[PDB]
Structures are given as C-alpha cells and as structure tokens.
C-alpha cells in the first residue's frame, strides 16, 4: 500500500490529479485504516472538481478521524462548491471549533452566510477573520 500511495503523492504534487486517484485507490484497496490517505483522495477529486466525490473521501476520513479540522474544513469547502451553504456553515462550525486559528476560515463561514442571506452572522464572522488578519 505505501510505495503505491506515494506514487500517488508524487503526481499529485505535479498537479497530475487522475493519476494520484488511480494510485491513492490502488493503495487504499491494499490498505484502508489511514484517515490521512482517504483525506488525500478527496483532496485529488476537489483538485479536479468532482466535488460529490471529494464529499464521500472526506466523509471517510471522518468516520475513521474525527479530530482533524483540515478534513472539516475542506469538507465543508466541498458543499461550498456545490452551493450547500448549510452545510458547509455546519462543517466550517466544526473545524472551527476544532482550530479557531485561521482567518481564511471564519472568512469562508462568513461568506457561507453572506450566500445564504443571512448578513449579521456574515459579519459576525468577517469581523472574526478581519481582528487576525486585516491585510485582504
Ligand atoms: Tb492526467
Ligand atoms: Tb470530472
Ligand atoms: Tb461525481
């Protein structure tokens, strides 16, 4: 599982996103325990836009880990792509939770809530974002 995991990492640092999921795949048949290694497959299917796909890796990578916030986040990043503004809020919350550090991500929660309509907690957010980093 490993040397053919790592032949998937390979390609995907070369911005070969097909190629790393036919190998994660190969890798993750010999050898599915790793959250780590489903979480990079759904990372190669956002990278190519097939972001249903990136859901159902991401969602693996929870079932197995629950305690990463980068798996949340791009989770919720996902069903920002596909307009689930709800529930990319709810994933956003948990990441968040999880690690309140980055501003990038109380930004992405703000505009979650700015798609939806629902402007105080937009700005509730994009204040929280803006006291860490008030460069953009
Ligand atoms: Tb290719
Ligand atoms: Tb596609
Ligand atoms: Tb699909």
């Known amino acids: 599982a490993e040397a053919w995991y790592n032949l998937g990492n390979a390609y995907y640092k ?62 919720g990043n996902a069903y920002y792509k596909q307009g689930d503004y709800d529930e990319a809020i709810e994933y956003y919350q948990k990441a968040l939770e999880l690690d309140p550090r980055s501003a990038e991500a109380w930004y992405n929660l703000g505009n979650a809530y700015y798609k939806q ?15 860490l980093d008030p460069r953009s």
């Open 14 to 75: 070369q911005g070969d996103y097909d190629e790393a999921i036919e190998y994660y795949q190969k890798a993750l048949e010999l050898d599915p325990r790793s959250a780590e290694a489903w979480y990079n497959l759904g990372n190669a299917y956002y990278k190519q836009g097939d972001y249903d796909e990136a859901i159902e890796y991401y969602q693996k990578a929870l079932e197995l880990d629950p305690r990463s916030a980068e798996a949340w986040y791009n989770l």
């Open 117 to 131: 309509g629902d402007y105080d907690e937009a700005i509730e957010y994009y204040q929280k974002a803006l006291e």
